Amino acid sequence: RKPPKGMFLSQEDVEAVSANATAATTVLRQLDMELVSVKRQIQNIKQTNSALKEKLDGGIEPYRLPEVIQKCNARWTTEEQLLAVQAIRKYGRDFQAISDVIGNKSVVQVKNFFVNYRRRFNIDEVLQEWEAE
Amino acid sequence: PSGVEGAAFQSRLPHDRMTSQEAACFPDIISGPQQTQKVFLFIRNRTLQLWLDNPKIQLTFEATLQQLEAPYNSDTVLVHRVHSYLERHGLINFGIYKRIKPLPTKKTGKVIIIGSGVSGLAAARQLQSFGMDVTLLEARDRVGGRVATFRKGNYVADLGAMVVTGLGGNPMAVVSKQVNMELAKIKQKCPLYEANGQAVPKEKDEMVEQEFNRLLEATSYLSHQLDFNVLNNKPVSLGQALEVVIQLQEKHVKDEQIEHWKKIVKTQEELKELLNKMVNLKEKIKELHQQYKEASEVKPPRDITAEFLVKSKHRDLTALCKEYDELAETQGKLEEKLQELEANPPSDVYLSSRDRQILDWHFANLEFANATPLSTLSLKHWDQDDDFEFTGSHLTVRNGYSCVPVALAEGLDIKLNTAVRQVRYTASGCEVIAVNTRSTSQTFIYKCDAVLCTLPLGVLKQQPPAVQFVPPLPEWKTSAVQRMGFGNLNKVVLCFDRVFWDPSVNLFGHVGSTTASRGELFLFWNLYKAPILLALVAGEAAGIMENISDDVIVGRCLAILKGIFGSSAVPQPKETVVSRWRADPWARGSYSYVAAGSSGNDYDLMAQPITPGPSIPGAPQPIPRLFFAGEHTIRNYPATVHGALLSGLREAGRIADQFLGAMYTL
Ligand SMILES: Cc1cc2nc3c(=O)[nH]c(=O)nc-3n(C[C@H](O)[C@H](O)[C@H](O)COP(=O)(O)OP(=O)(O)OC[C@H]3O[C@@H](n4cnc5c(N)ncnc54)[C@H](O)[C@@H]3O)c2cc1C
Ligand SMILES: COc1cc2nc(NCCCN(C)C)nc(NC3CCN(Cc4ccccc4)CC3)c2cc1OC
Ligand SMILES: COc1cc2nc(NCCCN(C)C)nc(NC3CCN(Cc4ccccc4)CC3)c2cc1OC
Numbered sequence A: 001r002k003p004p005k006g007m008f009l010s011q012e013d014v015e016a017v018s019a020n021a022t023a024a025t026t027v028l029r030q031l032d033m034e035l036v037s038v039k040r041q042i043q044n045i046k047q048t049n050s051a052l053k054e055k056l057d058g059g060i061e062p063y064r065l066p067e068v069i070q071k072c073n074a075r076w077t078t079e080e081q082l083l084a085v086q087a088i089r090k091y092g093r094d095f096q097a098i099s100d101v102i103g104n105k106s107v108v109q110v111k112n113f114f115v116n117y118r119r120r121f122n123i124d125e126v127l128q129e130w131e132a133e
Numbered sequence B: 001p002s003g004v005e006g007a008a009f010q011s012r013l014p015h016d017r018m019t020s021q022e023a024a025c026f027p028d029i030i031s032g033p034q035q036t037q038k039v040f041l042f043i044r045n046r047t048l049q050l051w052l053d054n055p056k057i058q059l060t061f062e063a064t065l066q067q068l069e070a071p072y073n074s075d076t077v078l079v080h081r082v083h084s085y086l087e088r089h090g091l092i093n094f095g096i097y098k099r100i101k102p103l104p105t106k107k108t109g110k111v112i113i114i115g116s117g118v119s120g121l122a123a124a125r126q127l128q129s130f131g132m133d134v135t136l137l138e139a140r141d142r143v144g145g146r147v148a149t150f151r152k153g154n155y156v157a158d159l160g161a162m163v164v165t166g167l168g169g170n171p172m173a174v175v176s177k178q179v180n181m182e183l184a185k186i187k188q189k190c191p192l193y194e195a196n197g198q199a200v201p202k203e204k205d206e207m208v209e210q211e212f213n214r215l216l217e218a219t220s221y222l223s224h225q226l227d228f229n230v231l232n233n234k235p236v237s238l239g240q241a242l243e244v245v246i247q248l249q250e251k252h253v254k255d256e257q258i259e260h261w262k263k264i265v266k267t268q269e270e271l272k273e274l275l276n277k278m279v280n281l282k283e284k285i286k287e288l289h290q291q292y293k294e295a296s297e298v299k300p301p302r303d304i305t306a307e308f309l310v311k312s313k314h315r316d317l318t319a320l321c322k323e324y325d326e327l328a329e330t331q332g333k334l335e336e337k338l339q340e341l342e343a344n345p346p347s348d349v350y351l352s353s354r355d356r357q358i359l360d361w362h363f364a365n366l367e368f369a370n371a372t373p374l375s376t377l378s379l380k381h382w383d384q385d386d387d388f389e390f391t392g393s394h395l396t397v398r399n400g401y402s403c404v405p406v407a408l409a410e411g412l413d414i415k416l417n418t419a420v421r422q423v424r425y426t427a428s429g430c431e432v433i434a435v436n437t438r439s440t441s442q443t444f445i446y447k448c449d450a451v452l453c454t455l456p457l458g459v460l461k462q463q464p465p466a467v468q469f470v471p472p473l474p475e476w477k478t479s480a481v482q483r484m485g486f487g488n489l490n491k492v493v494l495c496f497d498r499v500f501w502d503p504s505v506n507l508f509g510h511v512g513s514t515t516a517s518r519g520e521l522f523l524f525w526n527l528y529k530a531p532i533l534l535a536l537v538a539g540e541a542a543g544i545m546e547n548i549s550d551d552v553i554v555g556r557c558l559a560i561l562k563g564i565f566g567s568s569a570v571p572q573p574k575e576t577v578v579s580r581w582r583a584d585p586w587a588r589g590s591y592s593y594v595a596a597g598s599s600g601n602d603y604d605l606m607a608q609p610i611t612p613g614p615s616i617p618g619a620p621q622p623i624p625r626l627f628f629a630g631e632h633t634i635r636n637y638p639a640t641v642h643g644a645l646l647s648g649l650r651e652a653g654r655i656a657d658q659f660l661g662a663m664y665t666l
């Protein structure tokens, strides 16, 4: 019922090799075509990827900026409110970005802001302006 | 097994069942109740045992009955029917043994036996044993046929049969007790040596051998599991099945490389897309960092939109720097996943040239044993006799295997140098017309009741016929002769003045350069006390090498041997002999094989006797007149000495039943 271990003999494959006098070395030439063309395609993608690696040389170390570690604070300064309204206009509901810009307001505090001042800062009007982009 | 069960096994019989032959001689018993069957079996096994415990003397019915205990010796008719069935069919009182009851004074019936090889000798010796009158006609100037044994001074070497293939169930075990054969086990250890002279490393030898065995089980799988027995109209040979199996292994080696490198590209393409993402990210990061610089120009204290711009660009930039660091962790994973894949590629080939040559030696070995190229063997049936293999190590006859025929011929009427040319068989009897081999116009004519033909199958196949049948053999017989395979296998005997090889090694191989010459001088035996090396030619080589002169053949051998043991170690041989069995007109080959398109059923067709038509018309159907024996007639033990022997015993029993009647069947 089972071929010996490490022998491969499928109903289908057997029919394929035996069909003609040459169809044995047909099937096995077409697996050297397939093999040489995959080993070729690897050689391109290796040179291609080697070029792209040389473009990234330097990393991004020149362009990194220090991190602002400021602690959350309950009090909204008018500075902070004004930054908020602008961050909203730019970022929509991405409360995470908005909190990063303002730099001393947690994501909860932001969502709160969205409700407290909703009427006074016309946050609906500001959000539909963001959507329009 | 041991005891009375032992004796059954040792006589090729099931200890616990009645055989088909027993059923036909004892249908009263086998159709009857189970208990009488066990009695029958016990009596049979027990009598077999008595014979086997001492096959150097005749075993009489009186003696047998004397040594049965009750209840079994109560029924002395049964015991008599059994003892006689066994005697008749050569299960007991066969070979050379001291006769207790002297031979019937007046002989009954007359039989002519063609050929004094083992099948004929064994038959003759039984018919004579039964009081028939037997004469053997032999074309050669010696007995034994394909048991041929070279002798010169102290040199002794079989050019024919050489090996006793195990004593467990082998009738030659009995013969060995009766005749002085100096039997000697063959150490199965076989060093190979590649074309150059260099021992094959234990690493390879074991790897290729395992692969050989797997390839074989594979062929069996194709045959029995996938019904791969016929391709096109033609029947499939073991050889085709091996190419197919090999090609599929080669294929799978490729299929697995394709899939391995196909993983490398897919990963290499992931890394491509990742690097493009990473370059466009670096480029946006450069662009922002600029803009943050430009906006940080605008110095405090500044309006809130300009404050926003600075902070807004600063988060956006650190968001992309975060994202790029993520993408560059991924990059080092993909790059490690690819160092792994280039580290573990599957294997590069199925077999090197150096491997595929070692494999061809294994295939040569198989061609040697079947005495034919594997392209000729039936895939389906080449191994049909495997079920009957004997137990015990293989042995050689050391004083030379001729010792057996020659023994069997004691007391028989053998006409040597008598070549049968025509066999005539009619309702009233037979005439066999022979000539003197030496002086061929001198004619002889033998009249008899029956002819036992033991002509080798090669002879029976010869066109134009060497022996003519009158009337001609029927299509059913001639077609079987045509379908059956008759192979070929030669030996070169090298007689030296000194031993220069390993004496503890009975045999050793030589690997051929090419496939086409894989059977050529591929194996060497060291078996005799004298310093002799025997070298086989097998497969497609056996046939081709018959056209090449002895000196050239002996050359090619010494070459191979110098190449293995060094030019300063290998003398000239004192004596050489080179067999050519296909050329031999009394053999025309070595032994039969199950050719593709044939079956083991053809071996039975060969053994069926021939009944000629009636002389007077509307006269009752005669007796059969022409009987057949020889290695090609016994399907369970073809192509052997034991099988020939057995076929002879068979026919003797069958001829006796026919012309002396069978008292035991009532
Ligand atoms: C090289 C070789 C190695 C072998 N090795 C082994 C082995 O190792 N182990 C094993 O078990 N078996 C082996 N055998 C097989 C064994 O030799 C035979 O199967 C067996 O001996 C055949 O006996 P036979 O009586 O059937 O035929 P044969 O011995 O061939 O007897 C037939 C007789 O008929 C004679 N003859 C032919 N034409 C005529 C004619 N026209 N008139 C009168 N006589 C004629 C022949 O000369 C011969 O004497 C080997 C055979 C060969 C060739
Ligand atoms: C008359 O001389 C021989 C007859 C053999 N008959 C069988 N019959 C087996 C039943 C049918 N097959 C198709 C299953 N097997 C053998 N070797 C066996 C082959 C290898 N295995 C071990 C093995 C199997 C697979 C792969 C590697 C090793 C055990 C011995 C034989 C070896 C002989 O001489 C030498
Ligand atoms: C289905 O599995 C096997 C079946 C085999 N059947 C035979 N039959 C022999 C022909 C029987 N008649 C027709 C004569 N021979 C084999 N090997 C051969 C047996 C051993 N010899 C070498 C040898 C012979 C005698 C003494 C020492 C070595 C070569 C290979 C076989 C090996 C097998 O798997 C592996």
Ligand SMILES: COc1cc2nc(NCCCN(C)C)nc(NC3CCN(Cc4ccccc4)CC3)c2cc1OC
Pocket (backbone or CB within 6 Å): B386, B387, B388, B389, B390, B391, B392
């Ligand atoms: C190392 O030497 C041998 C090992 C063997 N191992 C097995 N193992 C049994 C399972 C393996 N499969 C592949 C069969 N069977 C054998 N003979 C068999 C014993 C009984 N049968 C059944 C049978 C016997 C006679 C008539 C009809 C059927 C076949 C041979 C063997 C014979 C050997 O030396 C020769």
Ligand SMILES: COc1cc2nc(NCCCN(C)C)nc(NC3CCN(Cc4ccccc4)CC3)c2cc1OC
Pocket (backbone or CB within 6 Å): B391, B392, B393
């Ligand atoms: C006809 O009945 C049997 C005969 C056997 N003859 C031999 N050897 C005679 C030749 C002597 N030399 C040349 C080898 N070896 C066997 N088994 C051996 C038992 C140990 N192993 C392992 C094994 C494990 C599990 C099952 C079977 C074998 C290999 C063969 C046999 C097993 C049989 O039952 C079937």
Ligand SMILES: COc1cc2nc(NCCCN(C)C)nc(NC3CCN(Cc4ccccc4)CC3)c2cc1OC
Pocket (backbone or CB within 6 Å): B166, B188, B386, B387, B389, B390, B391, B392, B393, B394
């Ligand atoms: C149908 O079932 C089987 C038949 C077998 N027939 C043989 N014939 C070769 C002649 C064996 N005796 C009678 C001489 N050998 C086998 N295995 C062999 C066991 C191990 N040897 C190598 C070896 C043995 C002893 C010492 C050193 C090496 C090779 C294959 C077999 C295994 C079988 O299935 C299980």
Ligand code: NA
Pocket (backbone or CB within 6 Å): B114, B115, B116, B117, B118, B119, B120, B121, B145, B454, B455, B630
């Ligand atoms: Na004979």
